Design a protein around this ligand. Structure first.
Ligand SMILES: C[C@H](Nc1nccc(-c2c(-c3cccc(C(F)(F)F)c3)nc(C3CCNCC3)n2C)n1)c1ccccc1
Length: 348
């Protein structure tokens, strides 16, 4: 009883999907693959369908595809992208080669909200709350997004938000070069590889995002890596001695000690007119030393979100076994592991 499928040209490829999904129309494209919006007759819901490109072309690729499917299957939270269905035209591992992923259909992302909006301190409170609610759940399973930006944050008409982009291929060195938004939201510790980063790298991003919604301007519009580090240390001050030790990169640590020393600026004089609580929260998020940076769970209880905070409605995730990340397998084996994940999928 595998559903009956039907083929059709779209996004320069031959989409072969189950008849339940109708009216396939393209709404995107990149290296990862092409997304199509469609109508799910079985559920009456509008949906987005992503067809993966080159799923098992290399070992690094095959492992990537497995990581995404695994992360996507684990996610069961209102503020995190959900997997409504995952399918493949294949009828046996031997033919297996395509992978499709289905999720609800969202209207726009955070950049598409600021453009046609006047974000009030309440909206900002609401959007950041949701993000921290989702991160709490993500981090509780030792899952780190690593690349929070407005482009991977989706918002429906009601201002309800979801976190997207899990297990996507790493950004090329060229893609992080110059005056690009792809680097503006990264914590310095990973922007220049100071040390082995941890989950608070995401909090730094939330700070960059929140400020952007409060001011309407990019917080750290670096024109390149160095320029960006300067804008960052100008606002938060140069590293203290405790931090300098923590930086493994002998060269990076050596470089920093070359910059004229500077003091943390006064945020109340940087974000003029902002609610002092937002200002207090921002100073807690934008701390250079990732060990002293406020965590998501800790931020949810910050007074800034009192209007939305609720201890009993901010769930944690089930354990997530990611021991596969230190496993060496062949392309065929990562593929096979993928296939078991596809066929063993249980719709919500
Ligand atoms: C109109 C379109 N709708 C929409 N709805 C839900 C998810 C997505 C989606 C998926 C998507 C689609 C199907 C399945 C899955 C997965 F299952 F993998 F999670 C994800 N991937 C992306 C981007 C994010 C940035 N990097 C490139 C991909 N968007 C916006 N799009 C839209 C376009 C732009 C902005 C907002 C909405």
């Amino acid at each position: 009883e595998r559903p009956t499928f039907y083929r059709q040209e779209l996004n320069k490829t031959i989409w072969e999907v189950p008849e339940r999904y109708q009216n396939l129309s393209p709404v995107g494209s990149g290296a990862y693959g092409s997304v199509c919006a469609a109508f799910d007759t079985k559920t009456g819901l509008r949906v987005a369908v992503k067809k993966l490109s080159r799923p098992f072309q290399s070992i690094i690729h095959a492992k990537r595809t497995y990581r995404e499917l695994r992360l996507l299957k684990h996610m069961k939270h209102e503020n995190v992208i959900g997997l409504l269905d995952v399918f493949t035209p294949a009828r046996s591992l031997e033919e297996f080669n395509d992978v499709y992923l289905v999720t609800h259909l969202m209207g726009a992302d955070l950049n598409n909200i600021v453009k046609c909006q006047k974000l009030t301190d309440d909206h900002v409170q609401f959007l950041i709350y949701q993000i921290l609610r989702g991160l709490k759940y993500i981090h509780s399973a030792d899952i780190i997004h690593r690349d929070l930006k407005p482009s991977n944050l989706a918002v429906n008409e009601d201002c309800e938000l979801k976190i997207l982009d899990f297990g996507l291929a790493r950004h090329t060195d060229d893609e992080m070069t110059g005056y690009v938004a792809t680097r503006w939201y990264r914590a310095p510790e990973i922007m220049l590889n100071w040390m082995h980063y941890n989950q608070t790298v995401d909090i730094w991003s939330v700070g960059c995002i929140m400020a952007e919604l409060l001011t309407g301007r990019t917080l750290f519009p670096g024109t390149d890596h160095i320029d960006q580090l300067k804008l960052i240390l100008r606002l938060v001050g140069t590293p203290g001695a405790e931090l300098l030790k923590k930086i493994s990169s002998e060269s990076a640590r050596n470089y920093i000690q070359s910059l004229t020393q500077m003091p943390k600026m006064n945020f109340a004089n940087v974000f003029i007119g902002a609610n002092p609580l937002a200002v207090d929260l921002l100073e807690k998020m934008l701390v250079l030393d990732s060990d002293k940076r406020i965590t998501a769970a800790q931020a949810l209880a910050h007074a800034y979100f009192a209007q939305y905070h609720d201890p009993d409605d901010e769930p944690v995730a089930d354990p997530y076994d990611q021991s596969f990340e230190s496993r060496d397998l062949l392309i065929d084996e990562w593929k096979s592991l993928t296939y078991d994940e596809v066929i063993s999928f249980v719709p919500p």
